[PDB]
């Protein structure tokens, strides 16, 4: 009927554009979450290693006053 | 078996075993006959005749001789059923596209029957009560040609 072909056009990419955009974020997000994985493999590795040193403290003072 | 009086269930095979309309019963007769008769024989007959089904009857009356009763009728007693299908006036309306494609698409639904199940045994009664460009050429394309769009019959 053209005018519903024309207006079933219109609606289609005002929905296509939206769309691309929408992935433009998950390919920002990938490149953010891992930028951020990064900054937790050294906490913890800076974490439970810390337990070492502080037990290494607490174990030597107690074994100073006994 | 055998259906029980006035049903839909139309039975085929040999695994099986006259109202109303006043005056027309000669005339009415042989042609009930040609369109049925040549389509009743079962089923070798046919390739025997070797002629291909009619694609349709056209009925032409003075007003109010009641022709569409026969009508009716005459779809009745062909199947079981067909089930009837009854076209309005405009025929055309919907002036944008379209319209042109209704006349042609109430005929789509008989042919895809057909392609599904094509060679037997399925019938479709198509009737245009008050029978230019597209629709002239269209109901002609699809009524004969380009290829099969027999088994089934249409009156006007």
């Given at each position: 009927?053209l005018?519903?072909?024309?207006?079933?056009?219109?609606?289609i990419?005002?929905?296509?554009?939206?769309?691309?955009?929408?992935?433009?974020?998950?390919?920002d997000?990938?490149?953010?979450?891992?930028?951020?994985?990064?900054?937790?493999?050294?906490?913890?590795?800076?974490?439970?290693?810390?337990?070492d040193?502080?037990e290494?403290?607490?174990?030597?003072?107690?074994?100073?006053?006994? | 078996?055998?259906?029980?009086?006035?049903?839909?269930?139309?039975?085929?095979?040999?695994?099986?075993?006259?109202?109303?309309?006043?005056?027309?019963d000669?005339?009415?007769?042989?042609?009930?006959?040609?369109?049925?008769?040549?389509?009743?024989?079962?089923?070798?007959?046919?390739?025997?005749?070797?002629?291909?089904?009619?694609k349709?009857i056209?009925?032409?009356?003075?007003?109010?001789?009641?022709?569409?009763?026969?009508?009716?009728?005459?779809?009745?007693?062909?199947?079981?059923?067909?089930?009837?299908?009854?076209?309005?006036?405009?025929?055309?309306?919907?002036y944008?596209?379209?319209?042109?494609?209704?006349?042609?698409?109430?005929?789509?639904?008989?042919?895809?029957?057909?392609?599904?199940?094509?060679?037997?045994?399925?019938?479709?009664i198509?009737?245009?009560?008050?029978?230019?460009?597209?629709?002239?050429?269209?109901?002609?394309?699809?009524?004969?040609?380009?290829?099969?769009?027999?088994?089934?019959?249409?009156?006007?």
């Amino acid at each position: 009927a053209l005018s519903e072909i024309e207006t079933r056009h219109s609606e289609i990419i005002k929905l296509e554009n939206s769309i691309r955009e929408l992935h433009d974020m998950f390919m920002d997000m990938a490149m953010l979450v891992e930028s951020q994985g990064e900054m937790i493999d050294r906490i913890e590795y800076n974490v439970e290693h810390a337990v070492d040193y502080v037990e290494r403290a607490v174990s030597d003072t107690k074994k100073a006053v006994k | 078996f055998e259906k029980a009086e006035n049903s839909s269930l139309n039975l085929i095979g040999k695994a099986k075993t006259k109202m109303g309309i006043g005056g027309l019963d000669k005339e009415f007769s042989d042609i009930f006959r040609r369109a049925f008769a040549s389509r009743v024989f079962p089923p070798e007959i046919v390739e025997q005749m070797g002629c291909k089904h009619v694609k349709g009857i056209l009925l032409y009356g003075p007003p109010g001789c009641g022709k569409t009763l026969l009508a009716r009728q005459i779809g009745k007693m062909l199947n079981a059923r067909e089930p009837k299908v009854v076209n309005g006036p405009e025929i055309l309306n919907k002036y944008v596209g379209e319209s042109e494609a209704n006349i042609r698409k109430l005929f789509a639904d008989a042919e895809e029957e057909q392609r599904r199940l094509g060679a037997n045994s399925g019938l479709h009664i198509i009737i245009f009560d008050e029978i230019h460009d597209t629709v002239v050429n269209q109901l002609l394309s699809k009524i004969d040609g380009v290829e099969q769009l027999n088994n089934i019959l249409v009156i006007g």
